[PDB]
């Protein structure tokens, strides 16, 4: 059984590792080149709308480790130096005319990988662009010289060695010298003595040294010119502007301190890091800066340094002559912990958070001119400065970029009423964690939401005049009455509209230039602009069943299938036709095309019958109410809609099917799709100034033509019951949709289809959630290191309040009344959390449909849950139990545990409440719980045990202790047990029913730091890797299940593939109705991918040759080798990189012609064959 | 081969081997983004401080020799 796979990415990584800013486009506009994990991305923040748009996104197929920008003297465009996991340094130039990164230079100096002594981790550039220095973590440092030629093109020189044996580098930074010899300051630490002293005395009292390396340009050689030891170890440096602007020098950020230390006769200046007033953190914990941003002006310059608590300070340096006098820090604001920050002109700050969403703020004030205390290095104290954190008062949130990093669990299931499965993603970081629901489609912007009484069944939006550029009324039809609203910029309820709906309403339209028409089951009501009402009673005891309105026509269908036709005279009144036609059966839906501007009436009338047929009827007076063409349907119609782009008749049936049909005197060609599970309703909407149609079944789909090429894209939104086009000053082009018991004003701004989200905030970092089959709800465990439980936060906060009074200050001061009162928002001001053995774990029952949490269970202080499951036991009835594996007093480094516990819950009220059953203890942490044959398999340490349910505790029924290291996960087919060792890959264990004896009958030949897995069949397991790999391991068919260097029979690895991002969830599922199963994986960088099987050997050979061609014609951007990158830890086995293949569309046309002609094809054929994979296994909304 | 740090010979002690692979491991953590992410999520510490402690564990790992 040959198994060849094909990888593709659906949601590229959203977590940001680096972020630089500059004039990369070569204009006045400033862009932000950010680096995700393995993807280089060019973003542009708009100074007008304040939104961040992704200009470019390129997959580099390599590990980006350092990112810098520079500019030559007299230059107007910034280049991009990229330090990678390749043995090469690359200098790139963005091209706006071609929207691509042009690799200007690439030099090869070392081996591939994130190596110890191979440069690529650190990258510092001379602020005048004359030289660049790329350095490793240890022992190797190289310097290239940058000079432009006569054609103004950048040129690079040969490398200059600056190596120094037994040296570790904490950080490298180029020093701003005013066109002097280039200087590179860096933090070093010599470990030669620490390794040759068995006492450990040389290990201690060994501090790092700030060293200045000079590039002698006249002599063309680098020399370790300067060096001085530092008082305490520092984490990073900051380039202080020198030359004409400011004094040269570096800022050394250090544990609880910051030190300006320019060399020469400049004295070291230090200032303590200010701490927040009344820290809930452990006082033994220090405080460092996580990142820094620098803004340079011809007038002044300042810095913005963020702490571990997200505290951004505005650091300023006062200076006299060429020397610095003092370091002046001032509390700026607080944002989430950022991995990088960029201060841009026109007053904008880009904050790329280390985890979770990213943010773009507008600098309203510099942070001075307020009365907040400003600290200085010259201020004496011995004690640190204290400040008060406050809400955002110097920045305003202008844009928020949704990032899924880090994704820790993922279940792709259809929990909502829709048909396409949703991606339920447990992802986040501490207090900013969340459970986000992902639907792939068009983003819906909720303009307004208001609940409605009773059960609404319809809605319309009517203008007051034809020349009105905005609608006037929103009509909502219930069962026994209709409510009329006026969009008067306040959406007030109105009564004098004239509709006066004491009955349900079938239609509301604008007939005359200013006349309104309401159609209700008891008849027709005409409302002139002048408040005149002309009624129309239904003939006899009948009622009108259906209707079709128009700008100048009103067709109606009454019980018994009796049509009545009304036409408006140019004199403004309606005249009924002199004839009434009967049908072969009752009418269930009608549609009447809009009148063209020049013409005075529409000719065609679509009428669907209970006969399961649609019929076209002419309304021209030559053949008024005469049959034109009939058409049989596979089921009963539900709605009809005629629309132009060339006339199309749309049919939505009572089963979920939709049909488009050509139209004119006769209706001919046809297409259909399954939209089904729900009857398809059809509504006219105005999209992008054109007429689009909106289908409504299990999801709301939008069909619209695009360059004579249709599109049917679903909306990433819940099910809706009705919709109508909307236009107001608040929302110029929107859609009014009523759903079950709610009225919603929506808008379709974005046109591209992506994974859209709805986020449910959590309290702690989630580890796992399980699907309760009956309740369809979620049981989530949220565990965090270094944390306090809520009770400990209260008792500790209060304890501080008591200790506040013991100062005996005239006793008359109650600052505790302001301290105990305000609980600072934990999500924005960071989590008040500290401690090495401290933890915080919480069990939560959440409904996935809405955002509400059904139940909440707060655990003890030092208890940390790592496993959870929902199942039933054979000995008991159909009662659902929730088992939660917890650990006690976890010292993570070095590892040491006190014990573990297992909570058992009864989950009564069909998954709405948890009630405490018992808490059974155990000696080691249990990190794996799985239901198995009416009983539960629990993994405690390296021991795999079979447990049954008891009235007092979970009784141990079986045990196995021959597992190598530690159980991280366990999944079981009905008969076998697949154990995931923390280090020794997968272990196959059979459970003997007769003796309760777990027997290991197979294991792996390779060690694998497993993170997650999923059983593909009875013999194959797909597993993820801590190092970012994915494998598929298959048992040979001759494996004997009943038996009694590790095990006898081994399992062969049939697939190896390095993804490049650590995968934490594998799931074999179908993404869309009608498609095929795919191996969808999530990753720790907030990315979603799929692995896809080939159906024929011809396709495998085709895409494989595409891979071989693009490996040489389109090599990775950062000098990495593609085959080597995908063979990082294990050689590639039966995977084709589809992310590389889809770059065929990005090559130059001559390369597409060469590669395609080599495969005896054309570039469009290659592109379509690449699209077929996405059509089969992913999302393709192309509607012929 | 001798001038490549991490290379071994016949008289290489276990302490030298494991301090070698320990420093290699720490630098690999510094390199691969999602690895440092997993570690910075396990222990509730920011990426910066995790990198800092990984750099402090460079002359410290396995303690002093014999
Ligand atoms: K029927």
How is A842-897 classified by DSSP, letter by letter?
Answer: EEEEE-SSSS-EEEEEE--SSEEEEEEEEE--SSS-S--EEEEEEEES-BTTTTB-
Residue to substitute from A110, A116, A189, A1025, interface B, most B β-carbons within 10 A: A116
Domain extents in chain B: 1-66
∠ CA A819-A824-A828, rounded to 5°? 160
Tell me how far apart the alpha carbons of residues A865 and A888 are, in angstroms, rounded to a whole number: 9
Tell me how far apart the alpha carbons of residues A386 and A92 are, in angstroms, rounded to a whole number: 45
CA distance B18 to chain A (A): 13
Tell me the helix, strand and coil percentages in chain A, rounded to 5: 5, 50, 45
Q: Phi then psi for A274, rounded to 5 degrees?
A: -65, 145
Tell me how far apart the alpha carbons of residues A137 and A128 are, in angstroms, rounded to a whole number: 25
- Tell whether the torsion through CA atoms of A390, A393, A395 and A397 is positive or negative: positive
Residue A1005 near residue A1053 (C-beta atoms within 8 A) = yes
Q: Is A813 exposed, middle or buried (0-12, 13-18, 19+ CB in 10 A)?
A: exposed
Residue A891 near residue A802 (C-beta atoms within 8 A) = no
CB distance B34–A63 less than 8 Å? no
Residues of B with Cβ-Cβ distance to A141 under 8 angstroms: none
Q: Which helix (H) or strand (E) holds B24?
A: helix B14-31
Contacts of A307 (CB under 8 A, 6+ apart): A273, A287, A288, A289, A290, A313
CA distances from A726 to A459, A504, A528, A746 (A): 11, 21, 22, 9
- Lookup: tokens for A364: 């309203």
Tell me how far apart the alpha carbons of residues A863 and A894 are, in angstroms, rounded to a whole number: 18
Residue A430 near residue A831 (C-beta atoms within 8 A) = yes
Q: Radius of gyration (Cα) for chain A, nearest Å?
A: 35
CB distance B28–A206 less than 8 Å? no
User: Preceding residues of all breaks in chain A (C to N beyond 2.5 angstroms)?
Assistant: 382, 645, 675, 810, 1044
**Half-sphere exposure in the Cβ direction for A987 (13 Å, CA):** 30
∠ CA A477-A479-A480, rounded to 5°? 100
- Lookup: tokens for A403: 């990032």
- In the stretch 390-419 of chain A, residues with CB closer than 8 A to chain B read 405-406, 408
Residues of B with Cβ-Cβ distance to A235 under 8 angstroms: 48, 51-52
CB distance A892–B42 less than 8 Å? yes
Residues composing chain A: 1184
Query: Which among A925, A940, A929 is positioned nearest to A977, based on CA atoms?
Result: A929
Query: Which among A48, A44, A49 is positioned nearest to A34, based on CA atoms?
Result: A44
Report chain A's terminal Cα–Cα distance, integer Å: 36
CB distance B31–A189 less than 8 Å? no
Q: Is A1131 helix (H, G, I), strand (E, B) or coil?
A: coil
Q: Is A806 helix (H, G, I), strand (E, B) or coil?
A: coil
- Tell whether the torsion through CA atoms of A117, A122, A128 and A129 is positive or negative: positive
Count CB atoms within 10 A of the CB of residue A790. Answer: 11
CB distance A290–B63 less than 8 Å? no
Count CB atoms within 10 A of the CB of residue A655. Answer: 17
**Residue A419 forms beta bridges with which residues?**
none
Inform me whether the C-beta atom of residue A1028 falls under 8 Å from chain B C-beta atoms.
yes
Tell me how far apart the alpha carbons of residues A867 and A862 are, in angstroms, rounded to a whole number: 16
Nearest CA in chain B to A892: B43
Tell me how far apart the alpha carbons of residues A236 and A186 are, in angstroms, rounded to a whole number: 9
**Residue A904 forms beta bridges with which residues?**
A883, A918
Q: Is B52 helix (H, G, I), strand (E, B) or coil?
A: helix
Helices and strands in chain A: count of H runs, count of E runs: 8, 91
Tell me how far apart the alpha carbons of residues A116 and B19 are, in angstroms, rounded to a whole number: 13
The Cα diameter of chain B in Å comes to 42
Tell how strand A79-84 and strand A64-70 pair up.
Answer: antiparallel
Count CB atoms within 10 A of the CB of residue A795. Answer: 13
**A587 CA to centre of ligand 1 in angstroms:** 11
CA distances from A786 to A273, A687, A782, B24 (A): 22, 51, 13, 27
**Half-sphere exposure in the Cβ direction for A918 (13 Å, CA):** 9
CA distance A740 to chain B (A): 40
Looking at the partner chain, which of A139, A170, A892 has a beta carbon nearest the beta carbon of B55? A170
Contacts of A1152 (CB under 8 A, 6+ apart): A1144, A1145, A1163, A1166
Nearest CA in chain B to A429: B41
Q: Which residues of A922-933 are buried (b: 16+ CB within 10 A; e: fewer)?
A: bebbbbbbbbbe
Residue A119 near residue A141 (C-beta atoms within 8 A) = yes
Tell me how far apart the alpha carbons of residues A1182 and A922 are, in angstroms, rounded to a whole number: 57
CA distance A126 to chain B (A): 24
Tell me how far apart the alpha carbons of residues A872 and A880 are, in angstroms, rounded to a whole number: 5
The top-level CATH class assigned to A5-401 is: mainly beta
Q: Is A732 helix (H, G, I), strand (E, B) or coil?
A: coil
Report CA dihedral (A1158, A1161, A1163, A1164) to the nearest 10 degrees: -170
Inform me whether the C-beta atom of residue A40 falls under 8 Å from chain B C-beta atoms.
no
The Cα diameter of chain A in Å comes to 113
Inform me whether the C-beta atom of residue A192 falls under 8 Å from chain B C-beta atoms.
no
CB distance B27–A200 less than 8 Å? no
Angle between helices B14-31 and B47-56 (to 10 degrees): 160
**A558 CA to centre of ligand 1 in angstroms:** 18
Query: Which among A1163, A1118, A1169, A1161 is positioned nearest to A1145, based on CA atoms?
Result: A1163
Tell me how far apart the alpha carbons of residues A409 and B41 are, in angstroms, rounded to a whole number: 13
Contacts of A778 (CB under 8 A, 6+ apart): A424, A435, A769, A770, A771, A772, A844, A845, A846, A847, A848
Tell me the helix, strand and coil percentages in chain B, rounded to 5: 60, 0, 40
Looking at the partner chain, which of B28, B38, B55 has a beta carbon nearest the beta carbon of A114? B28
- Tell me, which fold does domain A445-759 have in CATH? Methylamine Dehydrogenase; Chain H (2.130.10)
Inform me whether the C-beta atom of residue A763 falls under 8 Å from chain B C-beta atoms.
no
Tell me how far apart the alpha carbons of residues A69 and A1048 are, in angstroms, rounded to a whole number: 56
CA distance B52 to chain A (A): 6
């Amino acid at each position: 059984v040959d198994m060849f796979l094909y990888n593709l990415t659906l949601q590229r990584a959203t977590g940001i590792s680096f972020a630089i800013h500059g004039n990369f486009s070569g204009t006045k506009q400033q862009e932000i080149v950010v680096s995700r994990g393995k993807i280089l991305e060019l973003l542009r923040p708009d100074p007008n709308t304040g939104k961040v748009h992704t200009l470019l996104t390129v997959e580099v197929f390599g590990v980006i480790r350092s990112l810098m920008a520079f500019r030559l003297t007299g230059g107007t465009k910034d280049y991009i130096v990229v330090g990678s996991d390749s043995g090469r340094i690359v200098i790139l130039e963005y091209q706006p005319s071609k929207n691509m990164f042009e690799k200007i230079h690439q030099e090869t100096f070392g081996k591939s990988g994130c190596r110890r002594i191979v440069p690529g981790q650190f990258l510092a550039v001379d602020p005048k662009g004359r030289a660049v220095m790329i350095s490793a973590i240890e022992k190797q440092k190289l310097v290239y010289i940058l000079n432009r030629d006569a054609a103004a093109r950048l040129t690079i020189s040969s490398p200059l060695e600056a190596h120094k044996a037994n040296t570790l580098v904490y950080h490298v930074v180029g020093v701003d010298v005013g066109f002097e010899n280039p200087m590179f300051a860096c933090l070093e630490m010599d470990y030669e003595e620490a390794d040759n002293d068995p006492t450990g005395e040389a290990a201690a009292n060994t501090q790092q040294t700030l060293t200045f390396y000079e590039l002698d340009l006249g002599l063309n050689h680098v020399v370790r010119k300067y060096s001085e030891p530092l008082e305490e170890h520092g984490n990073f440096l900051i380039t202080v502007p020198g030359g004409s602007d400011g004094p040269s020098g570096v800022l050394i950020c250090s544990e609880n301190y910051i030190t300006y230390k320019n060399f020469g006769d400049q004295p070291d200046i230090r200032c303590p890091i200010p701490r927040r007033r009344n820290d809930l953190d452990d006082p033994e914990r220090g405080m460092i800066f996580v990142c820094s941003a620098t803004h340079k002006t011809k007038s002044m310059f300042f810095f913005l340094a963020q702490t571990e608590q997200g505290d951004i300070f505005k650091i300023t340096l006062e200076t006299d002559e060429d020397m610095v006098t003092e370091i002046r820090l001032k509390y700026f604001d607080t944002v989430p912990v950022a991995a990088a920050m960029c201060v841009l002109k026109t007053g904008f700050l880009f904050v790329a958070s280390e985890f979770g969403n990213h943010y773009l703020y507008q600098i309203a004030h510099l942070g001075d001119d307020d009365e907040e205390p400003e600290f200085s290095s010259a201020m004496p104290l011995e004690d640190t400065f204290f400040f008060q954190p406050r809400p955002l008062k110097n920045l305003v949130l202008v844009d928020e970029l949704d990032s899924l990093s880090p994704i820790l669990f993922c279940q792709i299931a259809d929990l909502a009423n829709e048909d396409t499965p949703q991606l339920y993603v447990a992802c986040g970081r501490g207090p900013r964690s969340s459970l986000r629901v992902l639907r792939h489609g068009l983003e819906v912007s909720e303009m307004a939401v208001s609940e409605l009484p009773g059960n609404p069944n319809a809605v319309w939006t009517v203008r007051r005049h034809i020349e009105d550029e905005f609608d006037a009324y929103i009509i909502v039809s219930f069962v026994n009455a209709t409510l009329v609203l006026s969009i008067g910029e306040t959406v007030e309820e109105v009564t004098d509209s004239g509709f006066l709906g004491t009955t349900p309403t079938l239609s509301c339209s604008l007939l005359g230039d200013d006349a309104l028409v309401q159609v209700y089951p008891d008849g027709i009501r005409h409302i002139r602009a002048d408040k005149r009402v002309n009624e129309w009673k239904t003939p006899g005891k009948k009622t009108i069943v259906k209707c079709a309105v128009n700008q100048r026509q009103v067709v109606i269908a009454l019980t018994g299938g009796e049509l009545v036709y009304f036409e408006m005279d140019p004199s403004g009144q309606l005249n009924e036709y002199t004839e009434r036609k009967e049908m072969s059966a009752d009418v269930v839906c009608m549609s009447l095309a809009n009148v063209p501007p020049g013409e005075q009436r529409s000719r065609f009338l679509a009428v669907g019958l209970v006969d399961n047929t649609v019929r076209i009827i002419s309304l021209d007076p030559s053949d008024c109410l005469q049959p034109l063409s009939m058409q049989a349907l596979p089921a009963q119609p539900e709605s009809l809609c005629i629309v132009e782009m060339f006339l199309y008749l749309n049919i939505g049936l009572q089963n979920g099917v939709l049909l488009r049909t050509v139209l004119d005197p006769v209706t001919g060609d046809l297409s259909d799709t399954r939209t089904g599970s729900r009857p398809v309703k059809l509504f006219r909407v105005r999209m992008q100034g054109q007429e689009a149609v909106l289908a409504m079944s299990s999801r709301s789909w939008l069909s619209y033509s695009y360059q004579s090429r249709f599109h049917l894209t679903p909306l990433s939104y819940e099910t809706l019951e009705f919709a109508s086009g909307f236009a107001s000053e608040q929302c110029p082009e929107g859609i009014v949709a009523i759903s079950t018991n709610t009225l919603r004003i929506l808008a379709l701004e974005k046109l591209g289809a992506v994974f859209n989200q709805v986020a449910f905030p959590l309290q702690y970092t989630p580890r796992k959630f399980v699907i309760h089959p009956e309740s369809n709800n979620l049981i989530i465990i949220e565990t965090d290191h270094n944390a306090y439980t809520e009770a400990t936060k209260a008792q500790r906060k209060q304890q501080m309040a008591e200790e506040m009074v013991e100062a005996a200050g005239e006793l008359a001061a109650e600052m505790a009344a302001a301290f105990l009162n305000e609980n600072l928002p934990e999500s924005i001001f960071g989590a008040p959390k500290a401690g090495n053995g401290q933890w915080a774990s919480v069990i939560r029952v959440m409904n996935p449909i809405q955002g509400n949490t059904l139940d909440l269970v707060q655990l003890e202080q030092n208890e940390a849950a790592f496993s959870v499951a929902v199942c039933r036991f054979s000995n008991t009835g159909e009662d659902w139990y929730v088992l939660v594996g917890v650990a006690k007093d976890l010292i993570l480094n070095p590892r040491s545990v006190a014990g573990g516990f297992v909570y058992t819950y009864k989950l009564v009220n069909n998954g709405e409440k948890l009630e405490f059953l018992h808490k059974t203890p155990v000696e080691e942490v249990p990190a794996a719980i799985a239901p198995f044959q009416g009983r539960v398999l629990i993994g405690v340490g390296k021991l795999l045990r079979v447990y049954d349910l008891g009235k007092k505790k979970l009784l141990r029924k079986c045990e196995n202790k021959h597992i190598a290291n530690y159980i991280s996960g366990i999944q079981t087919i009905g008969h076998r047990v697949i154990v995931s060792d923390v280090q020794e890959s997968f272990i196959w264990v059979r459970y003997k029913r007769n003796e309760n004896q777990l027997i290991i009958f197979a294991d792996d030949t390779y060690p694998r730091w497993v993170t997650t897995a999923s059983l593909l069949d009875y013999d194959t397991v797909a597993g993820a890797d801590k190092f970012g790999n994915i494998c598929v391991v298959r048992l040979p068919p001759n494996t004997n299940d009943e038996v009694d260097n590790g095990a006898s029979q081994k399992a062969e690895v049939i697939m190896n593939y390095h993804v490049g991002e650590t995968v934490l969830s594998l799931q074999k599922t179908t993404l869309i109705p009608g498609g095929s199963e795919s191996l969808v994986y999530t990753t720790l960088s907030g990315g979603i991918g799929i692995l896809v099987p080939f159906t024929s050997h011809e396709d495998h050979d085709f895409f494989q040759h595409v891979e071989m061609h693009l490996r040489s014609e389109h090599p990775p951007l950062c000098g990495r080798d593609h085959l080597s990158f995908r063979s990082y830890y294990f050689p590639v086995k039966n995977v084709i990189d589809g992310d590389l293949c889809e770059q065929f569309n990005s090559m130059e046309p001559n390369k597409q012609k060469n590669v395609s002609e080599e495969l005896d094809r054309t570039p469009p054929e290659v592109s379509k064959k690449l699209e077929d994979i996405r059509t089969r296994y992913a999302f393709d909304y192309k509607d012929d | 081969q001798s001038k490549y740090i991490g290379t071994g010979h016949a008289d290489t002690t276990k302490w030298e081997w494991l301090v070698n692979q320990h420093r290699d491991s720490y630098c690999s953590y510094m390199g691969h983004f999602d690895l440092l992410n997993y570690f910075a999520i396990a222990e509730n510490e920011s990426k910066a401080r995790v990198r800092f402690n990984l750099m402090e564990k460079m002359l410290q790992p396995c303690g002093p020799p014999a």
